[PDB]
Design a protein around this ligand. Sequence first.
Ligand code: C5P
Ligand code: CA
Ligand code: MG
Length: 637
Amino acid sequence: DDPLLAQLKQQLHSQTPRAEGVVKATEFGFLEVDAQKSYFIPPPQMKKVMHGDRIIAVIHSERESAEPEELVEPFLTRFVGKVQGKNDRLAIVPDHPLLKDAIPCRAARGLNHEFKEGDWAVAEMRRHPLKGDRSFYAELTQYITFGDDHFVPWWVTLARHNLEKEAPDGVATEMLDEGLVREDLTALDFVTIDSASTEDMDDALFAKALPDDKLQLIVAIADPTAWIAEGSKLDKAAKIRAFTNYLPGFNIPMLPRELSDDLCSLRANEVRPVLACRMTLSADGTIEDNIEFFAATIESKAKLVYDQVSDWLENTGDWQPESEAIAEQVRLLAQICQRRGEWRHNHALVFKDRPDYRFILGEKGEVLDIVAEPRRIANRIVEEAMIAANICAARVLRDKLGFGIYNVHMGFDPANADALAALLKTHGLHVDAEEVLTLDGFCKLRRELDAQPTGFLDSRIRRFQSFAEISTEPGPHFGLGLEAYATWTSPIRKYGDMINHRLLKAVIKGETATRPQDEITVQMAERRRLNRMAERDVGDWLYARFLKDKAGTDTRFAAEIVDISRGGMRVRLVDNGAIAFIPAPFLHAVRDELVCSQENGTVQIKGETVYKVTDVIDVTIAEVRMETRSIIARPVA
Ligand SMILES: Nc1ccn([C@@H]2O[C@H](COP(=O)(O)O)[C@@H](O)[C@H]2O)c(=O)n1
Ligand SMILES: [Ca+2]
Ligand SMILES: [Mg+2]
């Protein structure tokens, strides 16, 4: 360089052949530029990069190779990992299954903690060879727990998603004067129906028979917002959290315990403030326009338990209602459930029973068992009432406000409707490209797709399915087969439901109301996504623990094929819900006679279909790698 010579070398440097792509590693790696273009990265060039870094590289020939030059976006930022080789030099291996190398690190200042071998930390990347640094380097920013802590699962997972490990701090109660007029519901025979363990009754039922074969339902929901003022510390604390995070064996509540457990909870034979909704149902099950929201106080008559209620109703088991009054409430409520089920059957969509697996844990967080808790009438009684109540709120907020915290499902996006109909044709199912975009046509497709003898064709259109949203705008819910949809029935566990509670309270008083900001539903969606990941990561750890001792044994498990790709089949164990992977080479000896097609949902050997997505097969457990929590399964025989 030399101003002339420098300008020249610059212009030369600038026209050097280049490519942008994502780094893929293993033994050297590749710069994956697109679907059918990749460049070999030699292992010396490897050193500059991490798996998954988005980079620009010099392309070299003379055999072509990519020589990394510039970082576009690093794979790794904030992460978790296990520390090594102590303070005389710390390094950290990311928990990332594809990131195998130790990264030199040190503790952030103020981090009191003396790190040892095995310790779990949260860390931040600070240096990268492509940013000119000699080495990769990270700062440790948080001490997690020690390497052989039994409670690893929980603490590492909460930390990795940066989620809170604690309930919020309780604040001196005193009930707020919102100038509500509370109807005295106290004489009435309200009952709660929850599982056994529950001490935090959110909700509350009362039924009454009417002339013309009608039924009256009142849903009474607990009253947190009668204590928590909009703008208070608990407020802003609850809003950040969005939802109680339910993890195997462990929840982190949105609200303080005293409030949840005690003051708000609809405990039997105690007087409680409530937000109530009285609805009138046709013989049809139809929710009539008769909808009345109002503040009230009730006194639960009977703290009921699901199984017991399900038993009494099927004339099985030992348990009877404490009185005729309660019996009649249960009977009326079962009648309501029946009409609503029918209604949703006929006019909406009823979701197909998905086993809900519960981990049964011991004191050191061991897995005793994982059981699919099946659903019985008492469960459906509650669900049908909660759904009708939430429909009620959606209508009234839409009507009286024009806004609320709504749950939103747009159906198939218009730009994918043609591809949709074409794929169904190839499988022999007629549907229309523009009818399926109407609520009615979406429901008709769903219905006949669930009359399918198997889930195959179903599976074929997962790729077209939209997901459930959060909106302040009233809107249809195609998944539920409903014009509208907003929840207010569990405000102690959901910030959105508290917001709707305050909105409904404005409507009741004839007050004006402010529309929630859209950043509202954005943060809510982010925490939901977080909580779901947190629960599956827990579960994953747990499943590995549970299945470790089955490794290499001939224990069989029936398993549903959930996904098929290039490298093999993902599989869900029917009896416990664990995820396992079956590598392609396990399915057939001769690589070139085997085709696992992601796009078809099939595995073929010598041109003949042997496996399909939704098939159930029997597998054994080949491997449980505790490092990565991965379960490897092999088909039987
Ligand atoms: N596109 C991607 C791919 C991975 N990464 C991160 O790499 C992280 C590495 O996980 P660990 O925290 O276990 O090392 C992932 O959990 C993910 O947050 C990312 O931030 N963006
Ligand atoms: Ca790793
Ligand atoms: Mg309840």
